[PDB]
Amino acid sequence: GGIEELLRKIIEDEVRHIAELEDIEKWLKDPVIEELLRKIIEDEVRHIAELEDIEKWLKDPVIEELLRKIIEDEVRHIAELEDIEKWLKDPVIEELLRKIIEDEVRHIAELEDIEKWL
Amino acid sequence: GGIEELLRKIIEDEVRHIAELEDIEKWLKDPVIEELLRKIIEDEVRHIAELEDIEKWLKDPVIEELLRKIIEDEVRHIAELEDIEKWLKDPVIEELLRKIIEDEVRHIAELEDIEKWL
Ligand SMILES: [Zn+2]
Ligand SMILES: [Zn+2]
């Protein structure tokens, strides 16, 4: 329970996003979207790695920047995925992007809550 | 043995570097050098996170950029720590930095060997 459970669920979301965004990149085959999604996937991979290891750094000043950067990534992801969602005319994929955005929004709120006190 | 043992030793080196560089920050009390060291520490933390999780991504295109970026960080660390070592007049700390640099050099060689075929 508690925060460790919240972080586990964030990690599970990020893992799913990678798989889902890789499917979306295969369906679309557009070069602007490929560059955006490639970089989002890179971020999501790092978020998984860092949050899996986060206990090691709880007493270390580095924790402030680790969480700040993950939150900043997620904020950028919402903006970019919203842009892609608006640009597309492909209702199934637009709905998938909307659901990913909802996850990213929740992650920002939860990580902000944790970052506040660390 | 094999690559997994090489990666385990790289991770153990990075963990040690963080502790050692944090000691060096505390001995030096020097804001300009300390800012450089704080950024190196942030990189080392991410290297540990990413290499601990690396099996997850071996079949994924992201693996190329994950390893490329770690290697690029290590290359920058050598340049910056070499310049810092030359700047200091503090033989014990200069020797500590020399040994960290040696580790970073070995990491680049081993990760380049691993990167080649992935
Ligand atoms: Zn995310
Ligand atoms: Zn290193």
CA A46/CA A19 separation, integer angstroms: 14
- Token representation of residue B76: 């920058």
CA A50/CA B114 separation, integer angstroms: 22
Q: Which helix (H) or strand (E) holds A102?
A: helix A91-115
What is the DSSP annotation of A20-80? Answer: HHHHHHHHH--HHHHHHHHHHHHHHHHHHHHHHTGGGGTTSTHHHHHHHHHHHHHHHHHHH
Q: Tokens 């890179």: give the residue.
A: A42
CA A118/CA A67 separation, integer angstroms: 9
CA B47/CA B96 separation, integer angstroms: 20
Give the domain CATH number at A35: 1.20.1260
Alpha-carbon distance A112 to nearest alpha carbon in chain B (angstroms): 20
CA A27/CA B61 separation, integer angstroms: 17
Closest residue of chain A to B54, computed from CA coordinates: A49
Tell if the CB–CB gap between A18 and B60 is shorter than 8 Å: yes
- Other C-beta atoms closer than 10 Å to the C-beta of B105 total 14
Task: Name the domain count of chain A.
Answer: 1
CB A21 within 8 A of CB A99: no
Q: Given its phi and psi angles, is residue B29 left (phi above 0), alpha (psi -120 to 50 degrees) or beta? A: left
Report which bound ligand comes closest to the CA of A17.
1
Q: Which residues contact A22 (CB under 8 A, 6 or more apart)?
A: A37, A41, B60
CA A49/CA B47 separation, integer angstroms: 9
Residue numbers of the domain that contains B51: 2-115
Closest residue of chain A to B41, computed from CA coordinates: A62
Largest CA distance in chain A: 48
Give the domain CATH number at B55: 1.20.120
Tell if the CB–CB gap between B45 and A57 is shorter than 8 Å: yes
User: What are the CA-CA distances from residue A62 to residues A105, B10, B19, B34, B37 (Å)?
Assistant: 24, 20, 12, 13, 12
Output the CA B33–ligand 2 centroid distance in Å.
17
CB within 5 A of ion ligand 2: which residues?
Answer: B 14, 44, 74, 104
CA A34/CA A42 separation, integer angstroms: 12
Rounded to 5 degrees, what angle do the CA atoms B92, B85, A62 make? 90
Choose among B18, B41, B46: nearest Cβ to A46.
B46
Cβ of A48 under 8 Å from any chain B Cβ?
yes
Tell if the CB–CB gap between B66 and A18 is shorter than 8 Å: no
DSSP letter, residue A117: T
Q: Tokens 């070995």: give the residue.
A: B106
DSSP collapsed to 3 states, chain B: CHHHHHHHHHHHHHHHHHHHHHHHHHHHCCHHHHHHHHHHHHHHHHHHHHHHCHHHHCCCCHHHHHHHHHHHHHHHHHHHHHHHHHHCCCHHHHHHHHHHHHHHHHHHHHHHHHHCCC
- Other C-beta atoms closer than 10 Å to the C-beta of A102 total 12
CA A39/CA B9 separation, integer angstroms: 29
Resolution (A): 1.7
Determine the distance from the C-alpha atom of residue A76 to the mean position of all C-alpha atoms in its chain, rounded to a whole number: 9
A chain contacts of residue B18, beta-carbon cutoff 8 Å: 60, 62
Task: Please count the residues of chain A.
Answer: 118
Alpha-carbon distance A102 to nearest alpha carbon in chain B (angstroms): 24
This entry's atomic model was obtained through X-ray
- Token representation of residue B94: 């200069």
DSSP letter, residue A116: T
